[PDB]
Amino acid sequence: CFPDGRCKRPPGFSPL
């Protein structure tokens, strides 16, 4: 996940 805004990553264990 980014510091400002939202986040978008596939299903796993630890997103960004």
List the topology elements.
Layout: no helix or strand
PDB class: de novo protein
Keywords: slba, Sunflower trypsin inhibitor, cyclic peptide, DE novo protein
Assembly: monomeric
Polypeptide structure, described:
This protein has 16 residues and is mostly loops. The chain is 0% helix and 0% strand. The protein contains no helices and no strands. 0% of the residues are buried.
* Quaternary form: monomer
Fraction in beta strands? under 5%
Largest sheet entry: none
Indicate the structural class. little secondary structure
User: What's the gyration radius in Å?
Assistant: 8 Å
Rough outline? elongated
In short:
The chain has 16 residues and is low in regular secondary structure.
Keywords, separated by commas or semicolons:
monomer, 16 residues, little secondary structure, 0% helix
